[PDB]
Amino acid sequence: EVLITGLRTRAVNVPLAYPVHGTAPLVLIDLATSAGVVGHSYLFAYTPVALKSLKQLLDDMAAMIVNEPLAPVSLEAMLAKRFSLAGYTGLIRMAAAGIDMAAWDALGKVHETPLVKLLGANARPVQAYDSHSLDGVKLATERAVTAAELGFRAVKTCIGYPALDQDLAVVRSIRQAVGDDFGIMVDYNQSLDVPAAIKRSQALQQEGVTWIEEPTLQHDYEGHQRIQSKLNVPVQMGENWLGPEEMFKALSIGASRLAMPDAMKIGGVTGWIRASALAQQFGIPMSSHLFQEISAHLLAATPTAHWLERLDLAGSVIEPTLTFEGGNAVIPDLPGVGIIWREKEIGKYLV
Amino acid sequence: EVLITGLRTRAVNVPLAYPVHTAVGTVGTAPLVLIDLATSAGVVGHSYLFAYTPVALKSLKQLLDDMAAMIVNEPLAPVSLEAMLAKRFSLAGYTGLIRMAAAGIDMAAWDALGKVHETPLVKLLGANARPVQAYDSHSLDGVKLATERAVTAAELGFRAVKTCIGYPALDQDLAVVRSIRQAVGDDFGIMVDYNQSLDVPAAIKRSQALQQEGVTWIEEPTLQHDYEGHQRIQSKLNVPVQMGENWLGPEEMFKALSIGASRLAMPDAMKIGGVTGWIRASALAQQFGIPMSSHLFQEISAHLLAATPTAHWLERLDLAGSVIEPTLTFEGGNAVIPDLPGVGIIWREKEIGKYLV
Amino acid sequence: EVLITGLRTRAVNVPLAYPVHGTAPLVLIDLATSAGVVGHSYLFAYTPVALKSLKQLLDDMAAMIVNEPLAPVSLEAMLAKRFSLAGYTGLIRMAAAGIDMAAWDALGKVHETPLVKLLGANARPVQAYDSHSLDGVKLATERAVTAAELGFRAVKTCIGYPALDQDLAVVRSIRQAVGDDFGIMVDYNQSLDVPAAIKRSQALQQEGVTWIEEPTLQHDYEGHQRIQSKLNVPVQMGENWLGPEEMFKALSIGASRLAMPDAMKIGGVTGWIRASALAQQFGIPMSSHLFQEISAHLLAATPTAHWLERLDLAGSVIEPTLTFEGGNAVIPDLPGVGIIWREKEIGKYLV
Amino acid sequence: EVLITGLRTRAVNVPLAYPVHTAVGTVGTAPLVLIDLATSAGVVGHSYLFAYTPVALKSLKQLLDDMAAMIVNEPLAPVSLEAMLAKRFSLAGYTGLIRMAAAGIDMAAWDALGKVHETPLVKLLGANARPVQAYDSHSLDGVKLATERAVTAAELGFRAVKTCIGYPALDQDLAVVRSIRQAVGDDFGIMVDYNQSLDVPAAIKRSQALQQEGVTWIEEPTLQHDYEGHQRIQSKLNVPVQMGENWLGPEEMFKALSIGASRLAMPDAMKIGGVTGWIRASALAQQFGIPMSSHLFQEISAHLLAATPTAHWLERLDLAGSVIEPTLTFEGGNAVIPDLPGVGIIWREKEIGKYLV
Amino acid sequence: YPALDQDLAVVRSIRQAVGDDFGIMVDYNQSLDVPAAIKRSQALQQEGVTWIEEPTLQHDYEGHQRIQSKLNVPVQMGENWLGPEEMFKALSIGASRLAMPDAMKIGGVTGWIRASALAQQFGIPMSSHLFQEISAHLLAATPTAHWLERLDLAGSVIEPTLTFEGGNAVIPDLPGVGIIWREKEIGKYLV
Ligand SMILES: O=C(O)C(O)(c1ccccc1)c1ccccc1
Ligand SMILES: O=C(O)C(O)(c1ccccc1)c1ccccc1
Ligand SMILES: O=C(O)C(O)(c1ccccc1)c1ccccc1
Ligand SMILES: O=C(O)C(O)(c1ccccc1)c1ccccc1
Ligand SMILES: [Mg+2]
Ligand SMILES: [Mg+2]
Ligand SMILES: [Mg+2]
Ligand SMILES: [Mg+2]
Ligand SMILES: [Mg+2]
CATH class of the missing domain: 3.30.390.10 (Enolase-like, N-terminal domain)
Known part of the structure; x- marks a missing residue:
């Protein structure tokens, strides 16, 4: 047909x-x-x-x-x-x-019909965190305040400054500005070797962070396991898995307590749904990486849905039909994904 | 809405x-x-x-x-x-x-x-309808009836049959399987189902004899919940062990696959958790590299197997045929999804x- | 005959x-x-x-x-x-x-002959804890005081409030009211994912609790193992095992340091006695879940007997022949279980 | 009270x-x-x-x-x-x-x-009396006496016998086992007991030859406390390894089962810890999927096996027959629990x- | 059947139904040439059959001899001999290790008794072909008696006074042959 x-x-x-x-x-x-x-x-x-x-x-x-x-x-x-x-x-x-x-x-x-309903699920709001970058103390703190004002209940900052003391100064300044009832995710963006990751991560843990993301090279699942083994705070990874088969190798060895597939790298909707089945059985809370427009639909059908990453790469060319209410992504009432070109x-x- | x-x-x-x-009598x-x-x-x-x-x-x-x-x-x-x-x-x-x-x-x-x-269920799940090879499922029938049923199944176009074994003596199992082979010839599948009837060492002994015979798989050789036991039996065989009809939810399947209980899987659409459970089971079978067949529920399983990356066989055991219109058909032993919305079940x-x- | x-x-x-x-x-x-x-x-x-x-x-x-x-x-x-x-x-x-x-x-x-003697054991009193629910600070504290007055040396409360701070407030208020020489068991009733369970449980551990029960989905034995691996305090589970075969799968992977089979779900007396043999070899102290009338007999024949759960579901229809002396369940001197219908x-x- | x-x-x-x-002489x-x-x-x-x-x-x-x-x-x-x-x-x-x-x-x-x-012990343990298949246990007898004893056991109705092997040469072991087979025919069990006499590699060599012969199990091929060694021998065999007569308490059984030392178990009612130990052993054998037989103590073991979920064989080796009344009987090679209170032991x-x- | 694998399939199937301690006789009913009979019979022999009957044209005694010479399993024939004189010609050249005269074609009782004396001297176990009623009598007088063929052609019209106990034909206690018309x-x- x-x-x-x-x-x-x-x-x-x-x-x-x-x-x-x-x-x-x-x-x-x-x-x-x-x-x-x-x-x-x-x-x-x-x-x-x-x-x-x-x-x-x-x-x-x-x-x-x-x-x-x-x-x-x-x-x-x-x-x-x-x-x-x-x-x-x-x-x-x-x-x-x-x-x-x-x-x-x-x-x-x-x-x-909206994609979430085609997948057999009901639309629901999903908590989103506002994703920032390696911004320095001043701008990171600024951007976290702005995010808190907009109703987001968590932010992510990129760390991995030349000194651990700089990582800590950024996190402390964000924490002062947003208070204790607020999520601060930190992303090392693969910047550390395993020993440096254990040291920096244990210090950040004492600080109070929500998760520690990609501490070392992304393909090094065993290295991630060794880092996670020395931490109470969850290690987060998965944005770099190409296909549910890469995710399965990382989950099979217990590389991290959290996962966040990228809707593109994981294999689209088809791959995401497979990924979601694995995260459910392995008991891994599953968040998204980028692709916020489709990830809102996908997370609503994901049994262990955790967070949506707000990082609006395509906003300058896509109509803002996806909205946020109290820091939660709201799926638009439109057929398919709700992407309309500008x-x-x-x-x-x-x- | x-x-x-x-x-x-x-x-x-x-x-x-x-x-x-059955061993008791006929149902x-x-x-x-x-x-x-x-x-x-x-x-x-x-x-x-x-x-x-x-x-x-x-x-x-x-x-x-x-x-x-x-x-x-x-x-x-x-x-x-x-x-x-x-x-x-x-x-x-x-x-x-x-x-x-x-x-x-x-x-x-x-x-x-x-x-x-x-839209047909298969298309709603995002897949195309495709014919799926089906085996005809028989029972603990003995030599006369197993031969008769096997000849009929071959005449209908099926390319495999399944018989139940677990007689008091291994030579009886072998006799039934050998008789079926004479009736269907060499280029034809014979699946055997022990229906949980053996302990591990008896299963290893019987299965090695059956393997020499040429069977397609050995199904549920021991208690269904004994995944470790299935693993130990499979470890002694070249023929694949088949199981899964008794998994209640993907979480039970997951436990069995995690320890390598069997080289084949066959979830039951009902016990695995319906369509929702089947799709999750399909994603596990794909990752674990397990060819995945169905157990009963032939009407819905024809749809579900078409969406299953490691689809293997459809079990033809037509429990509901008296009360459901035969819109599912078989051509060359392959189940053909009817062009009807949803599953294609119409009550009689x-x-x-x-x-x- | x-x-x-x-x-x-x-x-x-x-x-x-x-x-x-x-x-x-x-x-x-x-x-x-x-x-x-x-x-x-x-x-x-x-x-x-x-x-x-x-x-x-x-x-x-x-x-x-x-x-x-x-x-x-x-x-x-x-x-x-x-x-x-x-x-x-x-x-x-x-x-x-x-x-x-x-x-x-x-x-x-x-x-x-009473069931305990038919099983080949002597009657003995068994320490019991009084089991409460998700009661809020006021009623939990009240019920713990009442239990302490009645001679019980431990209580169980259900936790898993929206905030960890609420879990902690309940436990702290109970502890103030009952003192330090008293057991406070906490039950999450499967409410948490593994990371949330590790975080909440490590905080409760610092608080001082007796055990942490069913932190995550009951069938997730591996998840329970991962939670237990991050704790000094014992994880407790088992009320949801259907048959000694489910218990054996959980024990075989070291899901928890304590076990509490439910006399019904475990398979009755026949299943309980099998369960008791497994807990003995795996070195797991074994408590009961519900069914206090028969569990008093069963625990007296259990080599690693730990606690009896007092949670009187059937009291409105069963004569109170089972009694408590100094918080210990006392098996009645009656043939079989000592159940008489009201x-x-x-x-x-x-x- | x-x-x-x-x-x-x-x-x-x-x-x-x-x-x-024995290798030394006759006791x-x-x-x-x-x-x-x-x-x-x-x-x-x-x-x-x-x-x-x-x-x-x-x-x-x-x-x-x-x-x-x-x-x-x-x-x-x-x-x-x-x-x-x-x-x-x-x-x-x-x-x-x-x-x-x-x-x-x-x-x-x-x-x-x-x-x-x-009440008979079996009923006190919560089970019904049922007949339990028994094998007749012989010794390191050589060809003449093994044949003679095997013929007698078959005439008595037993459907299996056990012989002790571990002669200086493998061909001697094989000769005795083959001779027994001629005396009893093909539809009859022959258990073989090495009585801890071999090292691991010799046990693997001898056992593979015995396996080709057709034996029912290979018992205690090496030192009894070497569970890892039994595991390594079992890993090379299709025939099941049998052991357990030397476990002292369920805790020793547990250690052997935990590493997969053997596919069969046979606790001794005395060494396993009496009735109390046997019941615990029975619960372990059930969970580990191990068919469980007895060692000696035929009088009490007939009761105990009737309460054992994985009951397999009763060992007939009548050590105490001179001093205990023969209230335990055998019909068709199956031990029949006497209708007497407790175990049914009456001293002579x-x-x-x-x-x- | 058209293919040897079909012959083998039927024989193997029978074996599963009856078990190992049971005879399976096979009859080619004159359907093969000598070389095909040698090929098929050697495959059947590996299978375990009791005998191979009339592998080729019945009058080709030399051909039966050539087939028998290549087999350990015995070749069976004789149902088509017309008189002891035809049997004699086949035995004289060693056509088969078994014989089974037909009570009618061999020449009735008189021919059967003469056939029995030849089979004895030539060392040939002798079975019957059809005529089960009279053949039960005749085989009892036959020094090399082997098997009785139960193929009950006349059962609709003859009283069942011949009985079978443990697969053995039991002569009725009646004068002559024991045939009573229905x-x-x-x-x-x-x-
Ligand atoms: O997690 C991310 O979003 C990401 O890893 C990423 C990676 C690649 C492209 C976009 C975002 C990240 C964001 C900000 C700074 C560093 C890393
Ligand atoms: O696999 C099956 O279909 C089944 O296990 C079964 C089990 C329960 C219900 C229906 C079919 C089986 C088939 C043939 C003989 C015995 C058992
Ligand atoms: O452990 C329990 O008794 C139980 O898990 C339970 C579960 C189900 C029925 C009764 C008790 C529990 C009691 C109180 C509040 C929550 C959970
Ligand atoms: O299994 C036995 O009964 C035993 O191991 C034994 C051991 C010790 C005492 C009695 C029986 C055995 C039997 C036959 C030959 C040698 C050993
Ligand atoms: Mg990242
Ligand atoms: Mg089956
Ligand atoms: Mg509980
Ligand atoms: Mg021994
Ligand atoms: Mg003929």
Whole structure:
């Protein structure tokens, strides 16, 4: 009945509300169907260096998916098989996930139903934390105050300054400004070796933080386990898992007490739902990484849903239909994901 | 926004096309609870439960009728309903009859949700319909009847059959399996089911003899809850051990897979927790590298296996055929999903009246 | 020689001495024998939703057991085999256990001997704790004072309030009122995920509690192990094990340093005695859950007996032959379990 | 309320119907300590101990006589007495001779308790009497005598026999086992017992040859306390390894089962800790999925196996037949519990006088 | 059957139904040429059959000899011998290790007795073909008696005075052969 009829991609470098210590390289995806609906998703390329490559890959993948049914699960299986030799990971897997997210958006539109309801769940608000960067004491404290004013009950800051004392000064200044009934997540963004991570993390633990994220190299699951083994505070990781199979290797060894898959890297909706099944059985509270628009839907269907990360990479090109009430993400009452392009703005940012 | 507006159940004892022969004697009927889940969209979801023994039948019907109070007026959102039932039954024990009743609700809710969207369940789950190889399931039949049933199954187009073994002597098991082989030829599957009847060392001895014979798998060689025991049996075999029909929820499956209890899995759509449980089970089987087959509930399992990354076989054991229209068909031994919304279950209303308890 | 001749069940909703934050759904069981004695037991249905189902199941099981010898061990084997396909767990296993407890009561009567002596043990008093609920600071403190006055040396309170600070306020107020030479057990009743359980439990540990019970989902033995691994205070669990086989899976992985089987869920007397053998070898102090009347006998025969839970669900329909002296349960000098129906009261509560 | 009021012991060296042939020579008698536990109910509990070698006989009798002081005037409550003896001997070591003496008390106390209630022990333990398959136990007999004994056992109705092997050459072991097979035919069990005589690699080599032969199990291939060694031998075999006759208390059994030392178990009613220890052992064997047989003490083991969920075989090796009435009978090779209170042991008082030490 | 694997499948299936201590005779009913008979028979022999009967054309005694020469299992034949003189020709060249005359074709009682004397001298165990009523008598007088064929062609029209106990035919205590017509039944079937 419903077939894919075309794929269009647009590579953009878009401005960010708050610069990271100023633009995000994105691939915006339109998936045309025989039912007249168009699915939308986007990818984050992390670095402009990967941006044209990711767009080129998707365009070259158009011939593989055009005329195939709009069945994301069957499409995912087909792509997994076709890329089994090239390696169904990294940019290839990201591109497949962009297709998956646009296909589920389209399937939601075909049925005139928000994605969360198509998944069999009710919409519910999800607590969100406001994600900042390696901002220094002044700006980190400022941004936390602003977030608290807006109703967010937690913030994340990036740490990993040259000295542990600088990490601690940032956390202490945030804590003074927001008080004790407030979440402070800290992200080391893979910056430390295992011994340095144990030392810094035990000091931060005494400080009072909500979680310690990616203390060491992301692929080092055993290293994360050794760090977690020396901590009472939970270690958080998962944004870098490419597919539920990478997540499964990390969970199988007990690398961390929390998980936060990235909707793109984990494999889109199809991968997210598989990830959610694993986190449930392993008893891991599961949060999101980026992709706040689709992650609101996904978390509502996730048995161990924990936090949504608010980090609005695509706001300059996507209508703000996702809203926050008392720090909670509220899924819009729109079919599929609720992504609507800001078409006038896209033209400004094309690479 | 679509709400559940009613739950009706009917207990029936229905005739089986293949009477099930056991060590005790022959059972000619199956105890089922037929479920109708009414909605504010007007469509009605259909599912059913198998109660296994008439002893459990009225109790299971009573439990579902009492559980109606928990779900009527809730939104038709199976994942959310499941979470609520799991929490409400956390003290009583979200397992056994309670879990089976919750699964009957879940299966009817997904059938209703398919109907709300006028789409076959497989498509709602995001997959394409595909034919799925099916084996014909027989019983503890002895040589004469096993041969007769195997010839019939081959003539119908099936490419495998399953027989129940666990006779008093290993030579009896071997005799039945060898006889089936003569009837079906070499390029044909013979699954064997010990139905939990052996201790570990007897299972290792019998299974090694069966393995030399050429069987497709050895199913539930010992007590179902003894996952460590299945692991010890599997460790001595090249043929795969099959189990899973008795897992109550994905959490039981998870425990068995975590210790490597078997190289194959076959969840029961009811006991595993309905569609919602099956999808979670499918994600575990994929990660653990376990080919996944079905147990009973052929109507819904044809949909579910089409969405299962490691789909293996569909079990054809047609418990509800007297009371459900044969919209599921078989071509070349492969189950063919009907082009109907939801699961494609249409009651045979005139027939149901014959069998009510 | 002695045969079962009949089974009668009565479903009741009975009032509770202290309401849980007010009635208990019970199935009262009479097992008639050819020796003229009648065994008594009862089941707890947890929720009225399961009550009629459990009674119906038992009535339908009557034909399986009538004319069988009064041999609880052989009867248990028969029921295990007959329910091997349906699943010998949940309500079915509970119903089998109700039969088992009434059969051992009858066997005690046949021999005119209290159950504890039939089991080969001497009666001894067993320390009991008074079990309360999620009562708030005022009522929890009140109930603990009342329990201390009555001679109990420990109480259990249910915690898991929205904030950890509320858990702590309850425990601190109880502690002030009862002093330092007194047991305060805390029960989370499966309310927390593993990270939240580690955090709350380490805070409660610093407070001074006797044990932390069911911090997370009961079937999650691995999660309980991970929680226990971060604690000095013992984790307690077991009330939800259906059969000694579930207990064995939890003990085999070291899920908790304490165990408390429920006489019904564990499989009656037959299951309890098996459970007791496992707790002995694994070195686990073993307490009871509910069923105080039979648990007094059972604990006297348990090598690692720890505490009896006083939580009098059936008092409104059972004569108070079990007494407490200095907080210790005293087994009555009566044949079998010492259960005598309050027949006038039963009529008031029939469903 | 019923109190122990006396303990009498008698050391005897009794004639064996089957002299036991060993590598050294033939032993024609067994050293036993016969136990009478008097009570305030008037009934007297009977049990006995096997001392294994006459070297231990007087020491074991002396130990029991001295232990009398701990139990006379205590209530006849075997579980409570056991706890007290375990605590009192915690420093000396609650194992070996001390543990065996405590077990003799326990077995006599349960026999007395059966008598107090005028009920067979099996019924007191909550089970029905059922016949239990028995194998006839022979010794290191060589070809001529093993064949002769095997023919006699088959004529008596036994369906299995056990022979002792561990000759200097593997071909000798094989020769004896093959000869027995000719005498009994193919549908008959042959258990083999190495009686701790091999090192691990020799046991693996010999056992793989025996396995090809068709034996029922391979018993105690290496030193009894080397559980890891039994595990390593079992890991190389399809045939099950059997052990357990030398476990002193359930705690020793527990250590062996925890590492997977063997697929079968056979506690000795004395060494395992009497009835009280046997019941605990039975609960462990059930959970670990181990079929459980007996070692010696056929009179009490017929009761105990009837209460054992994984009951497997009863060992017929009639050490005390000269001094105990043959109230235990065999029909079709199955031990039949006599309808007598307690264990059904009645002393042959005229015979005992012949054999006193 | 058209394929050897089909023959083997049927024989193996029978074996599962009856167990190991039970005879399975196989009859090719003259259907094979000599080399096919040698190939099929060697496969059947590995299977465990009791005998291989009439593997090729009945009058080809030399052909039966050549087939028998390649087998350990015995070749059976003789149902088609017309008179002892035909039996004599086959035995003289060693056509088969077993014989089974048909009471009719061999020449009745008179022919059977002569056939029995030949089978004795040639050392051939001798069974019957059809005519179970008279063959029970005749085999009792046959020094090398082997098996009686139970194939009850005339049961609808002859009283069942021949009985079977433990699979053994029991001669009735009646004069002559013990054949008593079922006169009411015969009328149903007349041509
Ligand atoms: O967790 C994140 O959001 C992230 O790891 C990330 C990584 C990559 C891209 C966007 C966010 C992070 C955010 C801010 C500063 C450092 C790291
Ligand atoms: O696998 C099955 O279908 C089953 O285990 C079963 C169990 C319970 C109900 C229906 C089918 C089985 C099949 C054939 C013979 C015995 C058992
Ligand atoms: O441990 C208990 O007694 C129990 O877990 C329980 C559970 C279910 C029924 C009765 C008692 C508990 C008691 C009071 C409050 C919460 C939990
Ligand atoms: O298993 C036995 O009975 C025993 O180990 C034994 C050991 C010690 C005393 C009695 C029996 C055995 C039997 C036959 C040959 C050698 C050993
Ligand atoms: Mg991060
Ligand atoms: Mg099965
Ligand atoms: Mg509790
Ligand atoms: Mg031995
Ligand atoms: Mg012929």
